[PDB]
Amino acid sequence: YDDNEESQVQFVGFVSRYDLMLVHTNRHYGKTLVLNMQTNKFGIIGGYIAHILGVNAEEGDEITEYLNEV
């Protein structure tokens, strides 16, 4: 199959230093795509963040603190 969709990509960086990419698509039922540009791992989010982004426990909490905010 091939499906195309126009979506808003959000590049974010905050300070460890983190640089994330956020893809908002309708295919994941409100869930957001979070791409870690430094570890090149991604996950669909609705210590799972630390495990799904390849990052230690409290780095994952800092990503989680940024993610629940937005």
Next chain:
Amino acid sequence: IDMYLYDDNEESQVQFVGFSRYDLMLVHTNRHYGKTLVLNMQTNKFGIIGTDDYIAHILEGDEITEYLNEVI
């Protein structure tokens, strides 16, 4: 959490493709100078891919390379 470095948006085209069995996502973005983002659903890993450049590294990777040549 002392400093918020940046926060910018951009309209981008996302492709959902399906062809052992592979499920990929392709994000085209002006931020990466024409290089296409290739996401692997099953392995949850991605990479900024260009014609010049590893595939199985960053993502049975030889068959992914065959399909990506038909897109880029």
